[PDB]
Structure formats: C-alpha cells, structure tokens
Enzyme design. Structure first.
Site, PDB file in Angstrom:
ATOM      1  N   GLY A  30       0.893  -1.308  -0.388  1.00 37.61           N
ATOM      2  CA  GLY A  30       0.082   0.098  -0.079  1.00 37.61           C
ATOM      3  C   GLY A  30       0.772   1.304  -0.404  1.00 37.61           C
ATOM      4  O   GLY A  30       1.919   1.156   0.407  1.00 37.61           O
ATOM      5  N   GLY A  35       3.015   7.633   3.364  1.00 36.87           N
ATOM      6  CA  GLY A  35       4.863   6.589   2.642  1.00 36.87           C
ATOM      7  C   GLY A  35       4.043   5.527   2.213  1.00 36.87           C
ATOM      8  O   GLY A  35       2.936   5.162   2.105  1.00 36.87           O
ATOM      9  N   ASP A 142      -7.925  12.083  12.334  1.00 37.89           N
ATOM     10  CA  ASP A 142      -8.196  11.278  11.345  1.00 37.89           C
ATOM     11  C   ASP A 142      -8.759  10.307  11.662  1.00 37.89           C
ATOM     12  O   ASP A 142      -8.852   8.959  10.983  1.00 37.89           O
ATOM     13  CB  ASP A 142      -6.613  10.719  10.460  1.00 37.89           C
ATOM     14  CG  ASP A 142      -6.789  10.589   8.995  1.00 37.89           C
ATOM     15  OD1 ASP A 142      -7.495  11.143   8.797  1.00 37.89           O
ATOM     16  OD2 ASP A 142      -5.926  10.127   8.757  1.00 37.89           O
TER      17      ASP A 142
HETATM   18 CL1  LIG Z   1      -1.273   1.696   3.127  1.00 33.21          CL
HETATM   19  C1  LIG Z   1      -2.444   1.747   4.188  1.00 33.21           C
HETATM   20  C2  LIG Z   1      -2.004   0.076   4.911  1.00 33.21           C
HETATM   21  C3  LIG Z   1      -1.870  -1.038   4.650  1.00 33.21           C
HETATM   22  N1  LIG Z   1      -2.822  -2.367   3.564  1.00 33.21           N
HETATM   23  C4  LIG Z   1      -2.837  -3.195   3.742  1.00 33.21           C
HETATM   24  N2  LIG Z   1      -3.532  -3.406   2.666  1.00 33.21           N
HETATM   25  C5  LIG Z   1      -3.890  -5.230   3.604  1.00 33.21           C
HETATM   26  C6  LIG Z   1      -4.202  -5.417   4.906  1.00 33.21           C
HETATM   27  C7  LIG Z   1      -2.572  -4.760   5.613  1.00 33.21           C
HETATM   28  N3  LIG Z   1      -3.166  -5.188   6.801  1.00 33.21           N
HETATM   29  C8  LIG Z   1      -1.737  -4.157   7.620  1.00 33.21           C
HETATM   30  C9  LIG Z   1      -1.699  -3.024   8.148  1.00 33.21           C
HETATM   31  C10 LIG Z   1      -0.752  -3.255   9.041  1.00 33.21           C
HETATM   32  C11 LIG Z   1       0.050  -1.106   9.316  1.00 33.21           C
HETATM   33  C12 LIG Z   1      -0.979  -0.230   8.689  1.00 33.21           C
HETATM   34  C13 LIG Z   1       0.712  -0.443   8.575  1.00 33.21           C
HETATM   35  N4  LIG Z   1      -0.638  -3.618   9.594  1.00 33.21           N
HETATM   36  N5  LIG Z   1      -1.218  -4.772   9.064  1.00 33.21           N
HETATM   37  N6  LIG Z   1      -2.202  -3.317   5.456  1.00 33.21           N
HETATM   38  C14 LIG Z   1      -3.219  -0.318   5.392  1.00 33.21           C
HETATM   39  C15 LIG Z   1      -4.688   1.516   6.086  1.00 33.21           C
HETATM   40  C16 LIG Z   1      -4.712   2.448   5.116  1.00 33.21           C
HETATM   41  N7  LIG Z   1      -4.696   3.593   5.179  1.00 33.21           N
HETATM   42  C17 LIG Z   1      -4.189   4.773   4.855  1.00 33.21           C
HETATM   43  N8  LIG Z   1      -3.594   3.894   4.067  1.00 33.21           N
HETATM   44  C18 LIG Z   1      -4.079   2.812   4.357  1.00 33.21           C
END
Ligand SMILES: Clc1c(CNc2nccc(Nc3cc(C4CC4)[nH]n3)n2)ccc2nc[nH]c12
Length: 291
Positions: A30, A35, A142
C-alpha cells in the site's frame, strides 16, 4: 541544517540500528500520503510484520512524524495496533508494526453492506480505544474507515496515529487544520479551538460510511465539501430507512454541531446501541477472501 536537525531528533526517540539486517521478503502492499507499507518476514522467527516507511523530505509537516512512534509506544490496548520497533533508515522513518491480515475497514464498506451487529462491534472497538486516548488528552484527528484495521477473526484495531495532537492544562484546545475533509468536525473546519470532541464527530461520519458506503458530500471536491459541512446541518443518511431507531438515536449523539452537546466516548460506551455488538466472529463473513 533544518533536515539534519529532525534526523537527529528522531534518532533520539527510535530504536538504534537497521532492521534490514533481520528482515526478509519485503513486499509493498500500500501507499499512504505519508509513505508506503510493506510486509516482511522476521528471519529468526518466520513471523510476519508490517513496515511503514516515511521519507523525511516528503512530508507536509515533519513535526507530525513523532506521532508515528510516540503514540503507539505509550498506549497499548486490545483495540490499538501493536508497534514492535522504530528505526531511522537513511532519510526514512521505519515503523515495524503488527500485521493485521484483515486489512482496512474501507474495503468492507465499499463492497458490502454491514449489519448493525457488525456496525455496533466496530463502534465499540473504536470508542474503547478513543476513551483511553481522550483520557490522556490525545486527539486522533483522522478517524475514518481507512484508519481501522481488522484481523482474520474480526478483531478491530485503531491505526494511523500520525495526525495526533496533545491537549493539557496549558494547551486546552488545538487550532490547526488537520484531518480528512469529509470526516472533519464543523468546529475544526471553522478554524475554532477544538478538543477530543472532533473525534466523536468523525466517528459519526464513519458510521455513515458503514451504512451508505461513503461519507457525506463525497462526490463534491474537498474544499467545497468542507464549506458545506461548516454552513449546513448534520448530514443525513441516504439509506435512513435501512437503519434502526437504535442506530439512529446513537448516531444523533455523534453528529452534533456544538461539541459541548456532542457526546463523549465514555458516555457513548454506555449507550444501549452498543449492546447489539456481536463477537469478533460476526465480522469474519465480511472480509474479501471470505465473501
Ligand atoms: Cl497503505 C494502508 C494500509 C496498508 N494496506 C494493507 N492491506 C492489507 C492488509 C494490511 N494490514 C496491515 C496494515 C498494517 C499497518 C498499517 C501498516 N498492519 N497490517 N494493510 C492500511 C490502511 C491504510 N489507510 C491508509 N493507508 C493505508
């Protein structure tokens, strides 16, 4: 000399070293405004983590980066994302977090219709977290479906703390314009002094998300939508005939233009509607791989 100043400052709050020495199989998943996010393997254990990476030279407001680390470190909770470590790596701030398999809540609200058992279970999860945060004078600023992560078994955790602000006796309110436009509180948009109440407004907007699939004024441009939120009344549910009297009354305690009459987390935790909250097992059917 200003950038090197921030590096050293940040260097003093994060853990020493380079995590690249003990992590494997970096996989981008993501990209946020602040970032990008990777999953990786901890070589020594085979456990999975999530690595948020943030460039110091690519930030609208550098001083906010302390929130990325400081918030998660000082507040552990069943409903808050675990942070394992933080590092300075080159000109990047790396935060190593718990990996929530279920992804963000936004993928759910746009592709399915949550029922009120599911919606209640989410609101309880957030309010429980907000209650602890608000207690120590911390505003999230947020709150939205994006900032909510899920597990495989349907546990719910609050994430994205980079927009946090602290209030105290000497700083009773905040004044800066922070957050995501559609979810913003009317007092914050109006550029009035605000407190934790703005978080309760946003949650209301997030409840609209879970019901209508999107926030109010979402088709409008952000600047124009903000203007609408300020002048107009509390927004309506486009699918109000689909919500219960219970949900409606609860929501009516969230979407109050006067923060003084707007409910608090602690008060809302005791609301009858949250009794509808089912087990974590009830959230499982909604996730992408399951549906
Ligand atoms: Cl990029 C982005 C994500 C990351 N994308 C993602 N996809 C599938 C699963 C998963 N699980 C996670 C995430 C995390 C910690 C945050 C990094 N731990 N596990 N995350 C999530 C919410 C956002 N809200 C805005 N941007 C966001």
């Amino acid at each position: 000399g200003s950038h090197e100043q921030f590096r050293a400052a940040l260097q003093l709050v994060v853990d020493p070293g380079d995590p690249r020495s003990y992590l494997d199989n970096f996989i981008k998943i993501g990209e946020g405004s602040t970032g990008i996010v990777c999953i990786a393997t901890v070589r020594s254990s085979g456990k999975l983590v999530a690595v948020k990476k943030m460039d110091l030279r690519k930030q609208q407001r550098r001083e906010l980066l302390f929130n990325e680390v400081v918030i998660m470190r000082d507040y552990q909770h069943e409903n808050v994302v675990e942070m394992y470590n933080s590092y300075l790596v080159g000109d990047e701030l790396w935060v190593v977090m718990e990996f929530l398999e279920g992804g963000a809540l936004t993928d759910i609200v746009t592709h399915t219709r949550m029922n009120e058992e599911q919606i209640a279970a989410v609101c309880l999860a957030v309010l429980q977290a907000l209650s602890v945060l608000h207690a120590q004078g911390v505003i999230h600023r947020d709150i939205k479906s994006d900032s909510i992560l899920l597990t495989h078994d349907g546990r719910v955790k609050l994430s994205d703390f980079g927009f946090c602000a602290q209030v105290s006796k000497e700083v009773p309110r905040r004044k800066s314009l922070v957050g995501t436009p559609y979810w913003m509180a009317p007092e914050l948009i109006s550029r009035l002094p605000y407190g934790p109440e703005v978080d309760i407004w946003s949650l209301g907007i997030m409840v609209i998300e879970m019901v209508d699939g999107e926030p109010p004024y979402f088709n409008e441009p952000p600047l124009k939508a903000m203007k609408m939120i300020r002048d107009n009344l509390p927004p309506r549910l486009k699918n109000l005939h689909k919500v219960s009297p219970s949900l409606k009354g609860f929501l009516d305690r969230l979407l109050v233009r006067d923060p003084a009459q707007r409910a608090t987390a602690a008060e809302l935790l005791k609301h009858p509607f949250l009794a509808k909250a089912g087990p974590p097992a009830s959230i499982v059917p909604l996730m992408r791989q399951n549906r």
